[PDB]
């Protein structure tokens, strides 16, 4: 099993860990901030997914410094993760294209 597939697998596991830790820590950052909506675990988890995929729905977002710090890590993990799957598919196609010219 090639590096690029191990890495994509790793990045998926690591992103799901980031989405759960992020759920938990967003609620922990945002409770105590009057007006905050990112304060129960289930919608925190939905929030973490729409943040990682950079969907920017705009139904939920953090209003505190530590919530926003948590948000930044989730976004970076999401963009890296999905970038790494792209790199992995590039490698696969470059390989399949070497072979298809008998290199």
């Amino acid at each position, epitope marked *: 099993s090639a590096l690029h597939w191990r890495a994509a697998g790793a990045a998926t596991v690591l992103l799901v860990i980031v989405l759960l830790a992020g759920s938990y820590l967003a*609620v922990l950052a*945002e*409770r*105590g901030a*009057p007006g905050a*909506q990112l304060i129960t675990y289930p919608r925190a988890l939905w929030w973490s997914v729409e943040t990682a995929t950079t969907v920017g729905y705009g139904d939920l977002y953090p209003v505190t410094l530590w919530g926003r710090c948590v948000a930044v890590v989730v976004m970076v993990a999401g963009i890296t993760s999905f970038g790494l799957v792209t790199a992995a598919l590039a490698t696969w196609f470059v390989g399949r294209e070497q072979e298809r010219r008998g290199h």
Partner: antibody, heavy 118, light 108 residues
Framework: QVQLQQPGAELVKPGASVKLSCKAS????????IHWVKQRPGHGLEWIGE????????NYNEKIQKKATLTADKSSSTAFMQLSSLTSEDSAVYYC???????????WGAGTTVTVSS | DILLTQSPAILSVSPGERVSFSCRAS??????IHWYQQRTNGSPRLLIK???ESISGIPSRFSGSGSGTDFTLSINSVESEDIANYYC?????????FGSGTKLEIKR
């Protein structure tokens, strides 16, 4: 089972403080928040504050004079509320309740009647 | 902070009749409203969560409806054991807040 056990009563001299206890049983999660709610006789429910025992962070009602300090003992599954410098304004039933981090008080203690009097 | 208005404060009904308790939020809170029953000398008891969801242990007689700002807890065919104060509570925005309460009173 009784999920939340509170002492029936505390008498407190005016000016003095008191620690209320709240010993939890049944399922405990990392996610669990313990809340405290004040009810004066013939009056409604007043949210005082919350603590997350797994991390020990606490938040308080801004809109009222801060009387309370919340702590928890991870090992003995007990949450504490230190009410300090009481007056007759502070005479009330104090409920503890458990929230699974999903927004609603699944279960309440039976409440501690706190009387401030000489 | 979200204000929950429960008007009227007292609701009189005859035995076996249907009754509706109102809860109005000062801004939209979707379906993040939960309802408690508190009998005389008793602690609160969760009846309905997220505006409409059953709790096991609660008579089918109880139901909830509403979204946004206007929420209703209903009892089809009231009976004596329903005599209590009924409170609403929001979890949309920090901090959680309670309605001022509505007493049910039966005219027998």
């Amino acid at each position: 089972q009784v999920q939340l056990q509170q002492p029936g009563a505390e008498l407190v001299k005016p000016g003095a403080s008191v620690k209320l206890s709240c010993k939890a049983s049944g399922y405990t999660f990392t996610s669990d928040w313990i809340h405290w709610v004040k009810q004066r006789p013939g009056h409604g429910l007043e949210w005082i504050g919350e603590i997350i025992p797994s991390y020990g962070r606490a938040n308080y009602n801004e809109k009222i004079q801060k009387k309370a300090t919340l702590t928890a003992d991870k090992s003995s599954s007990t949450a504490f509320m230190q009410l300090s410098s009481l007056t007759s304004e502070d005479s009330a039933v104090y409920y503890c309740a458990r929230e699974r981090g999903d927004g609603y008080f699944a279960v309440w203690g039976a409440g501690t009647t706190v009387t401030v009097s000489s | 902070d979200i204000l929950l208005t429960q008007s009227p404060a007292i609701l009189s009904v005859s035995p076996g009749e249907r009754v509706s308790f109102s809860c109005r939020a000062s801004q939209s809170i979707g379906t993040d409203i939960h309802w408690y029953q508190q009998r005389t000398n008793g602690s609160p008891r969760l009846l309905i969560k997220y505006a409409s969801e059953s709790i096991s242990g609660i008579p089918s007689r109880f139901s909830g409806s509403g979204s946004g700002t206007d929420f209703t807890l209903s009892i089809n065919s009231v009976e004596s054991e329903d005599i209590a104060n009924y409170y609403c509570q929001q979890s949309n925005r920090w901090p959680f807040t309670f309605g001022s309460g509505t007493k049910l009173e039966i005219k027998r």
